[PDB]
């Protein structure tokens, strides 16, 4: 997934381009939340559909 | 040959009539090219006054001139060729080698000339601050190089007279420079304004100053004394108050009329330099 | 000996090895390493970069 | 300069004419510009 | 725009729209200002050098033609000398206005004053 | 000298931006 | 090698520098 | 050019290595 982009201008045409796994995904947003009565693969998998 | 000389372009050029008398070339100061003789003799203490800072006692037997065009190249994997992008055009680097200085004969010192061409590296202190060294021009004829600057020079002396050089080859190499913009830094603005050329924000191409606000502060008041019986109730209300002022913007020229309480109340009109507009009805 | 085939989609364009693909980097993580890609197009006039 | 609730805005103003020859090819506007017009692909028509 | 000549024409200075004649007064007060003639720019002007003999004659010749050069970028400028009988050194300047691709006559110049 | 100061301390930051991608 | 090590060292130790006093 | 900047890798990795050993 695309997430960064880096370019120069003056002469030198170059323009880099930076991508990441989707993990990069499940490491955007902090959250708050409690989970009660809940497997390892479970959790994994609430994680994953959201 | 001039069996194979292409006569296109020969008859193309221009025609020089030989001068009637043996020409020495000669280094002078730039913005002194143009300068004649101003003085029968040279006086060292006033400046501008057209006397070359280096006389050549021989001339050149040959004058090279290099010229490097810098593009950049970038490789590009699996093409046929690189990538050629235009960095920058370059300089032009003049060189004269093997000029001779000779007075063994005359038992004549070449130790002035030595000393003139080293005083080149020196700075220039101009008002009370060290600047860069001279920049010169070198003239032949009716020919000149460019705006250039003394880059390298070398001496190599044969023969002395009491220890005084009188016999040296000279290699020297100038090196072509921008051209010193003579238009000053500030007309060059004022220029760059009064064409339109520069980014525009609603501002004056002149700042107005105290006299033109003075001036506009008056004629804002003749008008407005003039009109005052068809400016609207919420005009006249508050000019009939001693209290209220008018201020004019000094970089937009906006004229504001202030109440009692010193508060921006209406917009009068515009102000430039010369006239008063007032607002639309 | 190496014959490279190297071929990008990204947004709606293409770059192939040969074009303007200049460089390449990659990365196949595990634990504390992730999965990125970082590579270099020449961008004539930054029209990409645009 | 063109001042907006946004910010200060450089602004290109010429006859129209050398406006659409120096934009021909869409290669001086941005790219986003040209995706912000073509956002809405659906368009309402009425139907008689 | 008011050409060099200060004339009065009909009661006030001739002003004129076309940039051909602005350019050849130009010219005109290029050459009617000596250097030091000018107050503020005392290095405008063309170099004047009268009583002196005709050996380096082409030297003034490529002053001017590069001080006209200088200063009036909207025209080209070719500076020819020729030595007459007396005393008489004749320059010809050869200008063209590069705005326009023909020779432009002046109706001011066939009037009668 | 100071080119290659500027030279290595981008080097060192563009390998520090690398990390910032390399490590999840 | 070495020498570079070192100068390479005091470059960044001394770009350090730069940045402690660059920022309030 | 990249030789270099990784060459940089490995002088700073290793300057900071000798820190380490370096201190109490």
């Known amino acids: 997934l695309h997430t960064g982009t880096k370019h120069n201008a003056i002469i030198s045409d170059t323009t880099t381009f930076t991508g990441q796994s989707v993990n990069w995904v499940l490491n955007r947003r902090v959250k708050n939340t409690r989970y009660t009565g809940v497997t390892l693969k479970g959790l994994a998998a609430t994680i994953t559909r959201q | 040959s001039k069996f194979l000389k292409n006569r296109a372009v020969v008859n193309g050029l221009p025609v020089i009539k030989n001068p009637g008398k043996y020409q020495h070339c000669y280094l002078i100061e730039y913005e002194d090219s143009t300068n004649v003789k101003q ?92 600047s ?117 913007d000094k970089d937009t020229g906006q004229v504001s009329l202030f109440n009692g309480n010193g508060e921006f109340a209406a917009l009068v009109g515009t102000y430039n330099g010369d006239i008063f507009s007032p607002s639309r009805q | 000996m190496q014959d490279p085939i190297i071929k990008i989609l990204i947004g709606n364009d293409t770059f192939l090895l040969g074009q303007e693909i200049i460089d390449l980097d990659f990365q196949i993580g595990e634990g504390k390493k992730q999965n990125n890609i970082n590579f270099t197009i020449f961008d004539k006039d930054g029209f990409f970069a645009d | 300069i063109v001042n907006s609730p946004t910010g200060k805005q450089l602004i290109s103003d010429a006859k129209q004419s050398i406006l659409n020859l120096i934009g021909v090819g869409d290669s001086n506007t941005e790219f986003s510009k040209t995706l912000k017009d073509c956002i809405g692909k659906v368009v309402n028509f009425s139907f008689d | 725009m008011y050409v060099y000549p200060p004339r009065i024409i009909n009661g006030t200075l001739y ?4 940039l051909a004649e602005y350019t050849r007064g130009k010219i005109l007060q290029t050459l009617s200002i000596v250097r030091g003639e000018l107050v503020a720019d005392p290095f405008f002007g063309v170099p004047l050098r009268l009583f002196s003999n005709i050996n380096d004659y082409q030297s003034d010749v490529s002053k001017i033609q590069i001080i006209l050069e200088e200063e009036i970028t909207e025209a080209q400028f070719i500076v020819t000398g020729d030595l007459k009988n007396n005393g008489i050194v004749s320059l010809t300047v050869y200008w063209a206005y590069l705005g326009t691709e023909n020779i432009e006559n002046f109706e001011i110049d066939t009037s009668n004053i | 000298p100071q080119a290659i100061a500027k030279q290595i301390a981008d080097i060192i930051n563009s390998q520090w931006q690398g990390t910032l991608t390399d490590y999840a």
């Open chain 5, 15 to 18: 002003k004129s729209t076309d």
């Open chain 2, 132 to 248: 860069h060294p001279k920049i010169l021009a070198f003239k032949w004829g009716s020919n000149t190089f460019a705006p250039c600057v003394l880059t390298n020079i070398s001496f190599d002396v044969t023969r002395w007279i009491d220890g005084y050089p009188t016999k040296a080859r000279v290699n020297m190499s100038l090196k072509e420079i921008q051209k010193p913009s003579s238009d000053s830094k500030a007309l060059e603005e004022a220029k760059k304004k009064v064409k339109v050329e520069t980014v525009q924000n609603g501002n004056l191409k002149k700042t107005l100053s105290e006299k033109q606000l003075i001036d506009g502060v008056k004629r804002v008041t003749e008008y407005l004394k003039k009109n005052i019986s068809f400016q609207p109730r919420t005009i006249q209300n508050i000019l009939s108050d001693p209290k209220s002022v008018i201020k004019i």
């Open chain 2, 39 to 130: 003085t029968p003799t040279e006086n060292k203490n006033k400046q501008q006054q057209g006397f070359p800072v280096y006389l050549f006692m021989m001339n050149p037997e040959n004058i090279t001139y290099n010229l490097p065009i810098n593009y950049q190249e970038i490789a590009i994997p699996f093409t046929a060729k690189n990538q050629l992008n235009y960095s920058n055009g370059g300089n032009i680097v003049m060189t004269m080698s093997n000029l001779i200085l000779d007075t063994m004969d005359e038992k004549r010192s070449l130790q002035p000339l030595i000393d003139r061409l080293i005083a080149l590296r020196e700075p220039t202190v101009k008002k009370g601050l060290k």
